[PDB]
């Protein structure tokens, strides 16, 4: 059971990490993409990427 539990916990943490701003103004790419021009969206997308 420990194997299954640890794998599930790791997967859950990894997939939950998708909902953090990391400093950017959003947590979903499409928002920043439709809300900003590229010459500015570059830095935000870069923060999210790192």
């Amino acid at each position: 059971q420990d194997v299954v539990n640890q794998n599930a916990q790791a997967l859950n943490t990894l997939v939950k990490q998708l909902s953090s701003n990391f400093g950017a103004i959003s947590s979903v790419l499409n928002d920043i993409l439709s809300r900003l021009d590229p010459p500015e969206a570059e830095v935000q997308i870069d923060r999210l990427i790192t």
Binding site: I25, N30, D31, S34, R35, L36, D37, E40
Partner: protein, 199 residues
């Protein structure tokens, strides 16, 4: 120090009409690209309007300094929206000078972002409690303006409005002229529901 706050909601908006209205001194948008403003659906757009001196317009930004932006007006550091400002001199050209406006010199507590300074009464400056005599160490902060045509072109009166619209708060109501479209199912397609975008 006394700015109107025109709460605006429940309509369809536009931006291009603000492109040919006038060559405003500054039309600067933070958090949103002024080109895409007619593509997303906001939530409870606000509207603050007032008139200042043309050189002070730089103070209107999230984290500037300046007597006006320190004792009259305050923006949050996470502001999302934008500022429009244009020289209003031809309509505010009083050769004797227009003196119907005032602003602060010093305040006990500096303002939080977006809080009205209704405390427009007598002000104490230092020691010797004046108790409403405007004597020594009790200075009236309300100083008039030098708005006249003979003044500097940079010191002319400027009309400013700051569209401060928050995002992702409620069922959106302020998106622009984007047209509706029939609805389909069971096909991997794009969509856009009140700004909520995806595929």
């Amino acid at each position: 120090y006394a700015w109107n706050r025109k709460r605006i909601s429940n309509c369809v908006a536009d931006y291009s009409v603000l492109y040919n209205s006038a060559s405003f001194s500054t039309f600067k948008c933070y958090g949103v690209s002024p080109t895409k403003l007619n593509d997303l659906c906001f939530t409870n757009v606000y509207a603050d309007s007032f008139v200042i001196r043309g050189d002070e317009v730089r103070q209107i930004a999230p984290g500037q300094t300046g007597k006006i932006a320190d004792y009259n007006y305050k923006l949050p550091d996470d502001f999302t929206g934008c500022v429009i400002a244009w020289n209003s001199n031809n309509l505010d050209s009083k050769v004797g000078g227009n003196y119907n406006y005032l602003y602060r010199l010093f305040r006990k507590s500096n303002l939080k972002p977006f809080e009205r300074d209704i405390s427009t009464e007598i002000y104490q400056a230092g020691s010797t409690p004046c108790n409403g005599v405007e004597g020594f160490n009790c200075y009236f902060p309300l100083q008039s303006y030098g708005f006249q045509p003979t003044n500097g072109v940079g010191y002319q009166p400027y009309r400013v409005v700051v569209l401060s619209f928050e995002l992702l708060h409620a069922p959106a109501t302020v998106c622009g002229p984007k047209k509706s479209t029939n609805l389909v199912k069971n096909k991997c397609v794009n969509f856009n529901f009140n700004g909520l975008t995806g595929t």
